[PDB]
Amino acid sequence: GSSGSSGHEDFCSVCRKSGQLLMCDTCSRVYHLDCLDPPLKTIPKGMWICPRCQDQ
């Protein structure tokens, strides 16, 4: 067989769809650009961090 495992996900953690997803520079989670909190639009310049990390 095979491990069949990966470090980071490959699906939105809000709507769960296919396509390009953002990556966090800390944890191992992915979030769309419109499915954020707060929501995003363009490429968030500078070290970006998901709202799940900044929060407890």
Residue ranges in contact with Zn ion by CB under 5 A = 12, 14-15, 24, 26-27, 32, 35, 50, 53
CA-based nearest residue to 29, from 15, 49, 7, 8: 8
**At closest approach, how far in Å is the CB of 2 from Zn ion?**
27
| Residue 1 beta carbon to Zn ion: minimum distance, rounded to whole angstroms | 31
Cβ–Cβ under 8 Å, residues 38 and 55: no
Q: Which is nearer to Zn ion, 3 or 41 (CB)?
A: 41
Residue closer to Zn ion by CB (options 4, 9) is 9
d(CA 21, CA 10): 7
